Design a binder for this molecule. Structure first.
Ligand SMILES: NC(=O)c1ccc[n+]([C@@H]2O[C@H](COP(=O)([O-])OP(=O)(O)OC[C@H]3O[C@@H](n4cnc5c(N)ncnc54)[C@H](OP(=O)(O)O)[C@@H]3O)[C@@H](O)[C@H]2O)c1
Ligand SMILES: NC(=O)c1ccc[n+]([C@@H]2O[C@H](COP(=O)([O-])OP(=O)(O)OC[C@H]3O[C@@H](n4cnc5c(N)ncnc54)[C@H](OP(=O)(O)O)[C@@H]3O)[C@@H](O)[C@H]2O)c1
Ligand SMILES: COc1cc(NCc2ccc3[nH+]c(N)nc(N)c3c2C)cc(OC)c1OC
Ligand SMILES: COc1cc(NCc2ccc3[nH+]c(N)nc(N)c3c2C)cc(OC)c1OC
Lengths: 507, 510
């Protein structure tokens, strides 16, 4: 069973090669926005120094020692490197990227072992380009632009500004005509803002510096407004406020709304993994691959530590669905089976189903490659005949593809959507699918459009959801591929990496 | 056949007698005063003429008003009394008078000498008169209904239930200020409470005119209409497609501007039928095709014999041969649409074959669930059958519908993969409007909302210029569906059973 698989084309990696790596920015400014004299840093505020070292050294996971394997990177202009006393460079615990057209890597080592320094002949884009390569992605966890006026200037305009994930700004409450170089965040809806709308995530109270001068200062974290996730958050808020009380099969309460639509850009490696509550990506990834393979044995997910189908695959449940002859974890002709073997007679999971039923995924892959204007390019799992033989009816039951300007868009129709767990999971799921299918057809990812039927929140989840509603959505992470694989069905979870995923903690 | 779906015994709890659409005609001073309770305080012959012309004239070329086709005017009894006996009734118009005391026979009598069977008393308010004028007796003859008022009648016209049938307001403003006027009329402004969710807009306004009553009395006319948000919602999509859509090309190689993924909603409440006003929808065709779908039919000759030729090209000997279907006779479309609805997965042979009990009866199951367990989330029927696809004349376009109950109302979602905004879409909106209305009747719920999901929404390149002319048009109100008779079985509904009332769409764009 190898000639029934999808063969990945020669143009597979170029579809999802990361052009630039995402980065955060860290700066100190005065009330006039000045950053320095182009030579040295004017003010002396030890509390900013501590903040700066912390924001740039600390890693996502707790108590993780920075090492070549996993550490942060700081990118800086050459003049900034010079402004640091030779004794204290390179900055410990981090990878020091230096932009210069006159100083090579080895040249930087001449002045003041181990490896923590790279020079780049180019600007911030080139640095982000290099950091996008395998040797740095995903070994480097977070990239920080620690700046220099010209570097900040490059960060705050296209193409780089669209990769800018957070601003960590310290404001020093002092002023002087001694500041030549300036740093200003573009205001919402201005030309300089290039479409971005910077939100304030946090602001500190005014603190006083123990520097002998009694200087005031404060910290702010700015983030680029995530309207896509706000779509979702709005819907949840509308459901709680205006939704109808309903009760599902068990008898559990639910707040419900009917008919809705959301969009998510998949462009430039962008992955719509929700940030206001961490999504279980590993399971998302494992299940989709399990779907694509037309797999119906749930143990294959259970084995890989994904238990999302554990309850629905138990003897207890299968019996309650009258499927008394199914082996435990054999779920019947669900999802993937309909995708790859529509209308094929089902017996047991371990049977051979090669070349049986309709192979919708393959058909679509073939159509996209030859006639991209086709309006019949859609698959479905909603098979009335198969339905009683399934452990569960499909929620996400239909998807349609669309091509424009060499970009693959995809719309998913979901009949019943749990806003709490299902919806975020399925958003990522169909993102991955569209990405993979785009790879298989030599196209770029476009948009994912989500259509909802009965969109619901669980009654007891209202209290938790209300707390999440008060969180400001953060920028989405990115998906990159460690390696490609000859066939579509051969792709493993470890073949792809989600980078710069910084969700909020739970509560 | 009793493989059919048996209709319920009663009308769904909360359902209402069909109400007629009406316009309101009024003359006010600047303070908003209309009369002294007894008479009009001012003398402006130009308003008199405007009133005669607006309430008398019909839509035609030079169509003389006759008992066969004419307008009706509804008035309070006091207003009738204010019109001097020798001018009753108002010529070329059905005179409907509201009174609990006076009867038809009371009204004629009180006339000077002479006949006038153009008078009818109504023992009730404006609601009763709008019900009456919806009778199978009146809907042929009565073309437009005018509320010529009385303070009390205007009051009733401006509140629910009546205000929702108000298609336009013709107001004359007389620039006199009389401290006399004790009766008032105020058009509620958009967003205010008295507007009760209606957004009133000025369609037209005359220049200020001077009356020739020898007092230089200033006056002016204006037409006020309620905003049709839902057709606006459609048109905005069309306009967004033309401005932002990508150039694409269909199977033949024809140019289209298109966008991917959009969603529209329409209210069906009390059998409101979203037939678009800015370009006439071929209702008869919509109706015949749907009942044809519901019955599980696949023989297009059934449709073309009823003078509905939409399936003609797709049913011909030439076309069926090209799709590889050398076995089907002409007009046999294969296991399409209705077949999948009523017999999902059944092996197909020919249109004339017996298919009872075969496949899955998706509609029958949905009807069943709605009646017993309406919070269900699996109440959806699909025509998209990957196995059956190659045996069909065309793959389904509207290919999935989901039902939803809330507040004893049946809502419904329609998924359409390919959407031509000019012809295919407004047709399909009506198709699923009707369906939801029928399924509501079949399960004893009252109609709710139609949600429409569009896949590839497009406009044809050649259709771009005509669309722009249509986009300039102002949407009128949606009509209503009125079932003039009933059936024992859902399948037994003929197109003749239902009447669309007050569908007055625009003429064709050049
Ligand atoms: N307040 C703060 O937080 C903060 C932080 C950092 C810096 N500053 C102040 O900013 C001032 C310096 O900023 P400024 O830009 O003059 O210097 P800044 O950019 O660090 O450094 C500029 C240098 O980086 C290298 N470089 C930059 N862009 C390049 C490109 N496109 N291609 C090749 N090389 C490139 C070039 O050096 P080569 O020609 O030698 O190759 C360029 O001269 C100092 O005051 C610094 O202290 C303030
Ligand atoms: N400026 C304009 O455009 C304009 C137009 C028309 C009239 N008007 C003014 O309107 C003034 C009078 O109006 P207004 O409201 O007092 O009277 P309006 O209703 O014309 O006349 C009162 C009549 O309404 C009838 N009516 C209303 N609701 C009814 C119901 N539910 N059932 C039975 N009968 C019902 C009553 O009949 P019964 O009491 O017999 O039961 C009553 O006789 C006139 O003086 C005239 O000047 C102005
Ligand atoms: C503390 O170690 C040192 C660091 C630096 N770097 C300059 C400097 C200072 C504060 C800063 N604060 C923020 N928020 N962001 C920066 N990018 C930043 C930089 C870039 C300069 C030093 O010499 C003055 C030094 O030794 C004191
Ligand atoms: C139609 O002819 C007549 C009508 C009326 N009805 C009062 C009256 C006057 C102006 C009016 N103007 C408008 N815009 N709409 C009306 N409803 C209206 C009415 C209702 C009173 C008459 O006696 C003067 C008369 O004879 C001229």
């Amino acid at each position: 069973m190898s000639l029934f698989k999808i063969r990945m084309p020669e143009t597979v990696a170029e579809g999802t090669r990361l052009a630039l790596r995402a980065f955060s920015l860290v700066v100190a400014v005065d009330e006039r926005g000045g950053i320095g004299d182009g030579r040295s840093i004017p003010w002396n505020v030890p509390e900013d120094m501590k903040f700066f070292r912390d924001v740039t050294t600390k890693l996502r996971g707790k108590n993780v020692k920075p090492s070549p394997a996993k550490r942060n990177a700081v990118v800086m202009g050459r003049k900034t490197w010079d402004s640091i006393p030779p004794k204290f460079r390179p900055l410990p615990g981090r990878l020091n990227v230096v932009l210069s057209s006159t100083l090579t890597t080895q040249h930087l080592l001449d002045g003041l072992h181990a490896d923590s320094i790279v020079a780049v002949n180019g600007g911030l884009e080139q640095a982000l380009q290099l950091l996008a390569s395998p040797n740095y992605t995903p070994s480097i966890e977070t990239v920080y632009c620690i700046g220099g006026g010209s570097v900040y200037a490059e960060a705050l305009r296209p193409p780089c500004v669209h990769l800018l994930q957070a601003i960590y700004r310290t404001t020093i409450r002092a002023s002087e005509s001694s500041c030549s170089v300036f740093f200003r965040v573009p205001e919402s809806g201005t030309e300089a803002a290039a479409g971005i709308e910077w939100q304030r995530e946090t602001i500190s109270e005014e603190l006083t510096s123990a520097n002998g001068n009694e200087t005031k200062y404060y910290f702010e974290k700015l983030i680029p407004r995530n309207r896509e996730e706000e779509q979702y958050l709005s819907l949840v808020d509308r459901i709680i406020r205006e939704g109808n009380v309903k009760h599902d099969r068990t008898g559990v309460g639910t707040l419900s709304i009917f008919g809705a639509q959301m969009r998510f850009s998949l462009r430039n490696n962008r992955l719509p993994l929700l940030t206001t509550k961490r999504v279980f990506w590993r399971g998302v990834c494992e299940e989709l691959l399990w779907f694509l393979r037309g797999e119906t044995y749930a143990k294959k997910l259970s084995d890989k530590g994904v238990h999302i189908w554990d309850d629905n695959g138990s003897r207890a449940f299968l019996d309650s669905r009258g499927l008394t002859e199914y082996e435990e974890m054999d779920l019947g002709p669900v999802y993937g089976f309909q995708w790859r073997h529509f209308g094929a007679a089902y017996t047991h999971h371990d049977a051979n189903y090669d070349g049986q039923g309709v192979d919708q995924i393959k058909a679509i892959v073939e159509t996209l490659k030859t006639n991209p204007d086709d309006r019949r390019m859609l698959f479905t799992a909603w098979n009335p005949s198969a339905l009683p033989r399934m452990a569960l009816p499909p929620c996400h039951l239909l998807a349609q593809f669309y091509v424009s300007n060499g970009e693959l868009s995809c719309m998913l129709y979901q009949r019943s959507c749990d806003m709490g767990l299902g919806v975020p999971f399925n958003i990522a799921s169909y993102a991955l699918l569209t990405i993979l299918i785009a790879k298989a057809t030599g196209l770029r990812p476009g948009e994912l459009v989500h259509t909802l039927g009965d969109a619901h929140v669980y009654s007891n989840h209202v209290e938790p959801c209300n707390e999440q509603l008060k969180r400001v959505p953060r920028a989405f992470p990115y998906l990159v591929f460690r390696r490609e694989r000859e066939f579509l069905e051969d792709y493993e979870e470890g073949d792809m990496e989600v980078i710069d995923y910084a969700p909020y903690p739970p509560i």
